[PDB]
């Protein structure tokens, strides 16, 4: 049975106006800006951007990849598909 989200979990993350996007739950570095309450720091593969999202916009990657893991014309999407499949826990700094 599922736990709450934790850093390193792989998801597709939804934001308004964008397709379900390959992403991970990040850690928060010591000294770094924390997210708002009940939100998680989401690192988006391919674009390498961070947004703060709650669980309603987070779809576990294993369950969802059939549906959402197909190429998309949007900038950075296909690079992101490669990253979540091939090296999802690397440094993208």
Short mmCIF file of N, CA, C and O in Angstrom, two decimals:
data_model
loop_
_atom_site.label_atom_id
_atom_site.label_comp_id
_atom_site.label_asym_id
_atom_site.label_seq_id
_atom_site.Cartn_x
_atom_site.Cartn_y
_atom_site.Cartn_z
N UNK A 1 0.85 -1.22 0.00
CA UNK A 1 0.00 0.00 0.00
C UNK A 1 0.87 1.26 0.00
O UNK A 1 1.96 1.28 0.58
N UNK A 2 0.43 2.33 -0.70
CA UNK A 2 1.27 3.52 -0.91
C UNK A 2 1.61 4.35 0.32
O UNK A 2 0.87 4.40 1.30
N UNK A 3 2.77 4.99 0.28
CA UNK A 3 3.18 5.89 1.34
C UNK A 3 2.92 7.30 0.81
O UNK A 3 2.49 7.45 -0.34
N UNK A 4 3.18 8.31 1.63
CA UNK A 4 3.24 9.68 1.13
C UNK A 4 4.43 9.78 0.19
O UNK A 4 5.34 8.94 0.25
N UNK A 5 4.40 10.82 -0.64
CA UNK A 5 5.52 11.15 -1.50
C UNK A 5 6.78 11.43 -0.66
O UNK A 5 6.68 11.99 0.44
N UNK A 6 7.95 11.08 -1.24
CA UNK A 6 9.23 11.35 -0.57
C UNK A 6 10.25 11.74 -1.65
O UNK A 6 10.12 11.40 -2.82
N UNK A 7 11.32 12.45 -1.30
CA UNK A 7 12.33 12.80 -2.29
C UNK A 7 12.81 11.55 -3.01
O UNK A 7 13.05 10.51 -2.37
N UNK A 8 13.00 11.69 -4.34
CA UNK A 8 13.46 10.65 -5.23
C UNK A 8 12.32 9.91 -5.90
O UNK A 8 12.51 9.19 -6.87
N UNK A 9 11.10 10.12 -5.42
CA UNK A 9 10.00 9.48 -6.15
C UNK A 9 9.85 10.03 -7.57
O UNK A 9 9.96 11.24 -7.75
N UNK A 10 9.53 9.16 -8.54
CA UNK A 10 9.35 9.57 -9.95
C UNK A 10 7.84 9.69 -10.22
O UNK A 10 7.05 8.83 -9.78
N UNK A 11 7.49 10.74 -10.97
CA UNK A 11 6.08 11.05 -11.25
C UNK A 11 5.96 11.62 -12.66
O UNK A 11 6.91 12.01 -13.33
N UNK A 12 4.70 11.72 -13.16
CA UNK A 12 4.39 12.76 -14.11
C UNK A 12 3.64 13.83 -13.31
O UNK A 12 2.79 13.51 -12.46
N UNK A 13 4.03 15.09 -13.53
CA UNK A 13 3.51 16.21 -12.76
C UNK A 13 2.68 17.08 -13.71
O UNK A 13 3.13 17.36 -14.83
N UNK A 14 1.47 17.48 -13.25
CA UNK A 14 0.58 18.28 -14.10
C UNK A 14 0.61 19.75 -13.69
O UNK A 14 0.37 20.07 -12.53
N UNK A 15 0.81 20.61 -14.69
CA UNK A 15 0.48 22.02 -14.54
C UNK A 15 -0.41 22.48 -15.68
O UNK A 15 -0.27 22.01 -16.80
N UNK A 16 -1.28 23.44 -15.35
CA UNK A 16 -2.20 24.07 -16.27
C UNK A 16 -1.47 24.44 -17.55
O UNK A 16 -0.44 25.10 -17.54
N UNK A 17 -2.02 23.99 -18.69
CA UNK A 17 -1.48 24.44 -19.95
C UNK A 17 -0.30 23.59 -20.39
O UNK A 17 0.27 23.84 -21.44
N UNK A 18 0.07 22.60 -19.57
CA UNK A 18 1.14 21.72 -19.99
C UNK A 18 0.66 20.28 -19.93
O UNK A 18 -0.16 19.92 -19.10
N UNK A 19 1.23 19.40 -20.77
CA UNK A 19 0.94 17.96 -20.67
C UNK A 19 1.58 17.41 -19.39
O UNK A 19 2.53 17.99 -18.89
N UNK A 20 1.02 16.32 -18.87
CA UNK A 20 1.60 15.56 -17.77
C UNK A 20 3.08 15.37 -18.06
O UNK A 20 3.38 14.79 -19.08
N UNK A 21 3.96 15.83 -17.15
CA UNK A 21 5.36 16.01 -17.50
C UNK A 21 6.26 15.10 -16.65
O UNK A 21 6.15 15.08 -15.43
N UNK A 22 7.28 14.40 -17.23
CA UNK A 22 8.20 13.60 -16.40
C UNK A 22 8.97 14.44 -15.38
O UNK A 22 9.53 15.49 -15.71
N UNK A 23 8.98 13.95 -14.12
CA UNK A 23 9.47 14.77 -13.02
C UNK A 23 9.86 13.92 -11.83
O UNK A 23 9.56 12.75 -11.81
N UNK A 24 10.54 14.53 -10.85
CA UNK A 24 10.82 13.84 -9.62
C UNK A 24 10.53 14.76 -8.43
O UNK A 24 10.55 15.97 -8.61
N UNK A 25 10.29 14.14 -7.27
CA UNK A 25 10.26 14.88 -6.01
C UNK A 25 11.71 15.15 -5.61
O UNK A 25 12.48 14.20 -5.46
N UNK A 26 12.07 16.41 -5.47
CA UNK A 26 13.42 16.78 -5.04
C UNK A 26 13.56 16.80 -3.51
O UNK A 26 12.60 16.87 -2.75
N UNK A 27 14.82 16.75 -3.04
CA UNK A 27 15.12 17.13 -1.67
C UNK A 27 15.23 18.64 -1.59
O UNK A 27 15.27 19.33 -2.60
N UNK A 28 15.20 19.16 -0.37
CA UNK A 28 15.46 20.59 -0.19
C UNK A 28 16.87 20.66 0.41
O UNK A 28 17.10 19.99 1.41
N UNK A 29 17.77 21.40 -0.25
CA UNK A 29 19.14 21.50 0.25
C UNK A 29 19.15 22.28 1.57
O UNK A 29 18.31 23.14 1.82
N UNK A 30 20.14 21.97 2.43
CA UNK A 30 20.36 22.84 3.60
C UNK A 30 20.51 24.27 3.11
O UNK A 30 21.25 24.53 2.16
N UNK A 31 19.83 25.18 3.81
CA UNK A 31 19.89 26.60 3.53
C UNK A 31 19.03 27.07 2.37
O UNK A 31 19.02 28.26 2.07
N UNK A 32 18.40 26.13 1.65
CA UNK A 32 17.63 26.50 0.48
C UNK A 32 16.18 26.81 0.86
O UNK A 32 15.68 26.43 1.92
N UNK A 33 15.51 27.56 -0.05
CA UNK A 33 14.11 27.92 0.09
C UNK A 33 13.23 26.66 0.12
O UNK A 33 13.32 25.82 -0.77
N UNK A 34 12.38 26.60 1.15
CA UNK A 34 11.47 25.50 1.38
C UNK A 34 10.18 25.74 0.60
O UNK A 34 9.86 26.89 0.30
N UNK A 35 9.40 24.70 0.24
CA UNK A 35 8.12 24.94 -0.43
C UNK A 35 7.09 25.42 0.58
O UNK A 35 7.21 25.18 1.78
N UNK A 36 5.95 25.94 0.09
CA UNK A 36 4.79 26.18 0.94
C UNK A 36 4.33 24.91 1.64
O UNK A 36 4.56 23.80 1.14
N UNK A 37 3.56 25.04 2.75
CA UNK A 37 2.88 23.89 3.36
C UNK A 37 2.06 23.03 2.40
O UNK A 37 1.41 23.53 1.48
N UNK A 38 2.15 21.71 2.63
CA UNK A 38 1.49 20.69 1.85
C UNK A 38 1.93 20.70 0.38
O UNK A 38 1.26 20.06 -0.41
N UNK A 39 3.05 21.38 0.03
CA UNK A 39 3.54 21.27 -1.34
C UNK A 39 4.92 20.60 -1.36
O UNK A 39 5.58 20.46 -0.31
N UNK A 40 5.27 20.07 -2.54
CA UNK A 40 6.56 19.38 -2.70
C UNK A 40 7.37 20.08 -3.77
O UNK A 40 6.87 20.66 -4.73
N UNK A 41 8.73 20.05 -3.69
CA UNK A 41 9.52 20.64 -4.78
C UNK A 41 9.62 19.64 -5.92
O UNK A 41 10.02 18.51 -5.67
N UNK A 42 9.15 20.06 -7.09
CA UNK A 42 9.08 19.13 -8.24
C UNK A 42 10.13 19.61 -9.24
O UNK A 42 10.05 20.76 -9.75
N UNK A 43 11.04 18.69 -9.61
CA UNK A 43 12.04 18.97 -10.61
C UNK A 43 11.57 18.34 -11.91
O UNK A 43 11.30 17.14 -11.97
N UNK A 44 11.41 19.17 -12.95
CA UNK A 44 10.88 18.66 -14.21
C UNK A 44 12.02 18.23 -15.13
O UNK A 44 12.93 19.04 -15.42
N UNK A 45 12.03 16.94 -15.51
CA UNK A 45 13.10 16.51 -16.42
C UNK A 45 13.01 17.29 -17.75
O UNK A 45 11.94 17.77 -18.14
N UNK A 46 14.16 17.44 -18.39
CA UNK A 46 14.20 18.01 -19.74
C UNK A 46 14.29 19.54 -19.66
O UNK A 46 15.24 20.11 -20.16
N UNK A 47 13.27 20.21 -19.09
CA UNK A 47 13.37 21.65 -18.85
C UNK A 47 14.28 21.97 -17.67
O UNK A 47 14.83 23.07 -17.57
N UNK A 48 14.40 21.03 -16.72
CA UNK A 48 15.17 21.19 -15.51
C UNK A 48 14.63 22.36 -14.66
O UNK A 48 15.38 22.95 -13.91
N UNK A 49 13.32 22.64 -14.73
CA UNK A 49 12.73 23.68 -13.90
C UNK A 49 12.14 23.09 -12.63
O UNK A 49 11.98 21.86 -12.51
N UNK A 50 11.93 23.94 -11.62
CA UNK A 50 11.33 23.49 -10.37
C UNK A 50 10.04 24.26 -10.16
O UNK A 50 9.99 25.49 -10.35
N UNK A 51 8.98 23.55 -9.79
CA UNK A 51 7.76 24.18 -9.29
C UNK A 51 7.29 23.47 -8.02
O UNK A 51 7.78 22.39 -7.65
N UNK A 52 6.36 24.12 -7.30
CA UNK A 52 5.89 23.58 -6.04
C UNK A 52 4.48 23.10 -6.28
O UNK A 52 3.62 23.89 -6.70
N UNK A 53 4.27 21.79 -6.10
CA UNK A 53 3.00 21.16 -6.44
C UNK A 53 2.52 20.28 -5.28
O UNK A 53 3.30 19.77 -4.47
N UNK A 54 1.19 20.11 -5.18
CA UNK A 54 0.65 19.17 -4.21
C UNK A 54 0.27 17.85 -4.91
O UNK A 54 0.24 17.79 -6.15
N UNK A 55 -0.08 16.82 -4.11
CA UNK A 55 -0.29 15.46 -4.60
C UNK A 55 -1.38 15.34 -5.65
O UNK A 55 -1.36 14.43 -6.44
N UNK A 56 -2.35 16.29 -5.65
CA UNK A 56 -3.38 16.22 -6.69
C UNK A 56 -2.84 16.33 -8.13
O UNK A 56 -3.47 15.87 -9.08
N UNK A 57 -1.63 16.89 -8.31
CA UNK A 57 -1.02 17.07 -9.60
C UNK A 57 0.15 16.09 -9.83
O UNK A 57 0.89 16.33 -10.80
N UNK A 58 0.27 15.09 -8.96
CA UNK A 58 1.43 14.18 -9.00
C UNK A 58 0.92 12.76 -9.28
O UNK A 58 0.24 12.17 -8.46
N UNK A 59 1.38 12.15 -10.38
CA UNK A 59 0.96 10.81 -10.77
C UNK A 59 2.19 9.90 -10.74
O UNK A 59 3.12 10.13 -11.52
N UNK A 60 2.20 8.89 -9.88
CA UNK A 60 3.36 7.97 -9.79
C UNK A 60 3.77 7.44 -11.16
O UNK A 60 2.95 7.06 -12.00
N UNK A 61 5.10 7.39 -11.42
CA UNK A 61 5.54 7.20 -12.79
C UNK A 61 5.24 5.78 -13.32
O UNK A 61 4.78 5.69 -14.45
N UNK A 62 5.47 4.76 -12.49
CA UNK A 62 5.22 3.38 -12.91
C UNK A 62 3.77 3.18 -13.38
O UNK A 62 3.59 2.68 -14.49
N UNK A 63 2.80 3.68 -12.60
CA UNK A 63 1.38 3.50 -12.91
C UNK A 63 1.00 4.24 -14.19
O UNK A 63 0.12 3.80 -14.95
N UNK A 64 1.63 5.39 -14.45
CA UNK A 64 1.14 6.38 -15.40
C UNK A 64 1.89 6.38 -16.73
O UNK A 64 1.51 7.11 -17.64
N UNK A 65 3.02 5.66 -16.79
CA UNK A 65 3.89 5.89 -17.94
C UNK A 65 3.29 5.41 -19.26
O UNK A 65 3.55 5.99 -20.31
N UNK A 66 2.48 4.34 -19.18
CA UNK A 66 1.77 3.87 -20.36
C UNK A 66 1.01 5.04 -20.98
O UNK A 66 1.10 5.32 -22.17
N UNK A 67 0.29 5.76 -20.11
CA UNK A 67 -0.59 6.81 -20.59
C UNK A 67 0.18 8.07 -20.98
O UNK A 67 -0.17 8.73 -21.95
N UNK A 68 1.18 8.48 -20.18
CA UNK A 68 1.72 9.82 -20.35
C UNK A 68 3.15 9.81 -20.92
O UNK A 68 3.64 10.85 -21.33
N UNK A 69 3.76 8.64 -21.05
CA UNK A 69 5.17 8.59 -21.46
C UNK A 69 5.31 8.41 -22.97
O UNK A 69 5.86 7.42 -23.41
N UNK A 70 4.76 9.33 -23.74
CA UNK A 70 4.89 9.28 -25.18
C UNK A 70 5.44 10.63 -25.62
O UNK A 70 5.24 11.64 -24.94
N UNK A 71 6.17 10.69 -26.76
CA UNK A 71 6.77 11.95 -27.20
C UNK A 71 5.77 13.08 -27.36
O UNK A 71 4.63 12.83 -27.70
N UNK A 72 6.24 14.30 -27.09
CA UNK A 72 5.45 15.51 -27.10
C UNK A 72 6.30 16.58 -27.76
O UNK A 72 7.53 16.60 -27.61
N UNK A 73 5.66 17.47 -28.51
CA UNK A 73 6.38 18.47 -29.27
C UNK A 73 6.94 19.55 -28.34
O UNK A 73 7.82 20.32 -28.75
N UNK A 74 6.43 19.62 -27.09
CA UNK A 74 6.75 20.74 -26.22
C UNK A 74 8.24 20.74 -25.87
O UNK A 74 8.83 19.67 -25.72
N UNK A 75 8.81 21.95 -25.74
CA UNK A 75 10.24 22.12 -25.53
C UNK A 75 10.65 21.33 -24.29
O UNK A 75 10.10 21.55 -23.21
N UNK A 76 11.66 20.47 -24.44
CA UNK A 76 12.28 19.76 -23.33
C UNK A 76 11.60 18.43 -22.98
O UNK A 76 12.18 17.62 -22.26
N UNK A 77 10.41 18.17 -23.53
CA UNK A 77 9.66 16.99 -23.12
C UNK A 77 10.39 15.67 -23.45
O UNK A 77 10.46 14.75 -22.63
N UNK A 78 10.93 15.54 -24.67
CA UNK A 78 11.50 14.26 -25.08
C UNK A 78 12.85 14.03 -24.39
O UNK A 78 13.20 12.88 -24.03
N UNK A 79 13.59 15.12 -24.13
CA UNK A 79 14.78 14.98 -23.31
C UNK A 79 14.33 14.52 -21.92
O UNK A 79 14.94 13.64 -21.32
N UNK A 80 13.26 15.12 -21.41
CA UNK A 80 12.80 14.65 -20.10
C UNK A 80 12.39 13.17 -20.02
O UNK A 80 12.61 12.55 -18.97
N UNK A 81 11.79 12.62 -21.09
CA UNK A 81 11.43 11.23 -21.17
C UNK A 81 12.71 10.39 -21.09
O UNK A 81 12.74 9.36 -20.42
N UNK A 82 13.78 10.88 -21.72
CA UNK A 82 15.00 10.09 -21.68
C UNK A 82 15.56 10.06 -20.26
O UNK A 82 16.06 9.04 -19.79
N UNK A 83 15.48 11.22 -19.60
CA UNK A 83 16.12 11.36 -18.31
C UNK A 83 15.38 10.50 -17.30
O UNK A 83 15.99 9.83 -16.52
N UNK A 84 14.04 10.55 -17.28
CA UNK A 84 13.35 9.79 -16.23
C UNK A 84 13.52 8.27 -16.42
O UNK A 84 13.51 7.50 -15.46
N UNK A 85 13.72 7.82 -17.68
CA UNK A 85 13.90 6.41 -17.97
C UNK A 85 15.33 5.95 -17.72
O UNK A 85 15.52 4.83 -17.25
N UNK A 86 16.30 6.83 -17.99
CA UNK A 86 17.68 6.37 -18.10
C UNK A 86 18.57 6.83 -16.94
O UNK A 86 19.53 6.13 -16.61
N UNK A 87 18.31 8.02 -16.38
CA UNK A 87 19.13 8.47 -15.27
C UNK A 87 18.32 9.44 -14.41
O UNK A 87 18.60 10.64 -14.30
N UNK A 88 17.25 8.93 -13.78
CA UNK A 88 16.34 9.84 -13.09
C UNK A 88 16.84 10.41 -11.78
O UNK A 88 16.26 11.37 -11.28
N UNK A 89 17.98 9.89 -11.25
CA UNK A 89 18.46 10.41 -9.98
C UNK A 89 19.82 11.13 -10.08
O UNK A 89 20.41 11.48 -9.04
N UNK A 90 20.13 11.53 -11.32
CA UNK A 90 21.39 12.25 -11.56
C UNK A 90 21.26 13.71 -11.17
O UNK A 90 20.17 14.26 -10.99
N UNK A 91 22.44 14.36 -11.06
CA UNK A 91 22.51 15.80 -10.96
C UNK A 91 22.33 16.44 -12.34
O UNK A 91 23.10 16.17 -13.28
N UNK A 92 21.36 17.36 -12.44
CA UNK A 92 21.04 18.07 -13.66
C UNK A 92 21.37 19.54 -13.46
O UNK A 92 20.90 20.37 -14.22
N UNK A 93 22.14 19.82 -12.40
CA UNK A 93 22.88 21.06 -12.25
C UNK A 93 24.04 21.05 -13.24
O UNK A 93 23.82 21.48 -14.39
#
